[PDB]
């Protein structure tokens, strides 16, 4: 079985490259971030523009939703993260402490902590309510490209240009495991699978890899796309067929069969690198976003 994703909407408004797109957990919204320093909120099903959220002084690399869809956190080159109330658009807290660009961020499932990663090679854990830093982890020896909590919040996975993937104990900040492969190419993205048993990691040698966390072993590799330059997000698609989804530096969205590793669809339409993709939590809908020549977000829908 292959999906049949087709273009339904194109979302214009950002004035520089889009850096990330994420669907709200309640499915109603898409949030986008951009090098233009702005966050924009859109309707997930019709692409209707809702509002612009502003406050960062430099471009934004990442945005993430809280579990209840009420808050966003953003990570900026201005060396801060900001927590936003989506309804009011107000900045609730500014998280200060990183000494260089903040590249990635996420809430835990409880949504009382935020994890961030930075060009300063550290991973920080922040209290959502106070906005203060709880722990600083000397996680890596090069910029940190992604950070993600597992399903019960007890673990954090981080990735870095140093070629390593590390798994951290949230409560203590101590390292539980280091994953290394081949000739340690930069790891540009990492996240836990929905059941927290696997880790999906992108490296800048045109390769995605699925790891068994408990055994520390590679189980699947996904190839065929172009990824040698940018930190491109990847996703598990779980609403219909079980796919792996990723953008690509040849301007396409790639979709693989998770078990067989075969490419099942390539979505054509963007006119620049597809830096970010997101999968809707209940519908067979993908959002994709592209760099400077394109600057748009596209919504695609499939029957399965």
């Amino acid at each position: 079985v292959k999906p049949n994703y087709a273009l339904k909407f194109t979302l214009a408004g950002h004035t520089k490259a889009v850096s990330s797109v994420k669907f709200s957990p309640n499915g109603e919204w898409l949030a986008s971030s951009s090098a233009d320093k702005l966050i924009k909120i859109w309707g997930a099903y019709d692409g209707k523009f809702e509002k612009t959220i502003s406050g960062h002084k430099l471009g934004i690399s990442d945005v993430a939703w809280s579990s209840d869809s009420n808050l966003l956190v953003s990570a900026s080159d201005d060396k801060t993260l900001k927590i936003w109330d989506v309804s009011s658009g107000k900045c609730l807290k500014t998280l200060k402490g990183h000494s260089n660009y903040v590249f990635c961020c996420n809430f835990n499932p409880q949504s009382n902590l935020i994890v961030s990663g930075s060009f300063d090679e550290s991973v920080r854990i922040w209290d959502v309510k106070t906005g203060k830093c709880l722990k600083t982890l000397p996680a890596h020896s090069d910029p940190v490209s992604a950070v993600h909590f597992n399903r019960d919040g007890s673990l954090i996975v981080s990735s870095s240009y140093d070629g390593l993937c590390r798994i951290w104990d949230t409560a203590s900040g101590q390292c539980l495991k280091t994953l290394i492969d081949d000739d340690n190419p930069p790891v540009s993205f990492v996240k836990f699978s929905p059941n927290g048993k696997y880790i999906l990691a992108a490296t800048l040698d045109n390769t995605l890899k699925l790891w068994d966390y408990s055994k520390g072993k590679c189980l699947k590799t996904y190839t065929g796309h172009k990824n040698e330059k940018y930190c491109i997000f990847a996703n598990f698609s779980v609403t219909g067929g079980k796919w792996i989804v990723s953008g690509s530096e040849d301007n396409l969205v790639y979709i693989w069969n998770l078990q067989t590793k075969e490419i099942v669809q390539k979505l054509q339409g963007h006119t620049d690198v597809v830096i970010s993709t997101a999968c809707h939590p209940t519908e067979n809908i993908i959002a994709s976003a592209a760099l400077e020549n394109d600057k748009t977000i596209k919504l695609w829908k499939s029957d399965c």
């Binding site: 490259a17 850096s19 090098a35 660009y101 830096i275």
Partner: peptide, 5 residues
């Protein structure tokens, strides 16, 4: 940021 090489 992420949008730059």
């Amino acid at each position: 940021a992420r949008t730059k090489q």
